[PDB]
């Protein structure tokens, strides 16, 4: 193939349009949503406050206090696995973390 060495697959990239659709239903200003919008989302997700804060702590890898469609998709993926009866590692492995926040010099 092209690389072989680096053949990484972002798990969220396979079910991103769904969390993306949910992202648009929260009214995204300048392409992001504020804490309020993702808050009400996590509010009715029926997850504990602690988990919600932890998911946010993983989602905003960009650290801009706002959630882009990338970051919200990450959050929704964590919430989805929660709903599916799983736990989120509370950590950002190389297959959870969006390459959009990897700046190399």
């Amino acid at each position: 193939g092209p690389l072989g060495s680096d053949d990484v697959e972002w798990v969220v990239g396979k079910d991103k349009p769904t969390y993306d659709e949910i992202f648009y239903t929260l009214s995204p200003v300048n392409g992001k949503i504020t804490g309020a919008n993702a808050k009400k989302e996590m509010v009715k997700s029926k997850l504990p406050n602690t988990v919600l804060g932890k998911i946010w702590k993983l989602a905003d890898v960009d650290k801009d206090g706002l959630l882009d469609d990338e970051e919200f998709a990450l959050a929704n993926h964590l919430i989805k696995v929660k709903l599916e009866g799983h736990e989120l590692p509370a950590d950002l492995p190389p297959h959870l973390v969006p390459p959009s926040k990897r700046r190399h010099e």
Binding site: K39, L52, G53, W56, K63
Partner: peptide
Amino acid sequence: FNYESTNPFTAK
């Protein structure tokens, strides 16, 4: 130890 919490779910 307090730090600038930027998490709107906890605030503190």
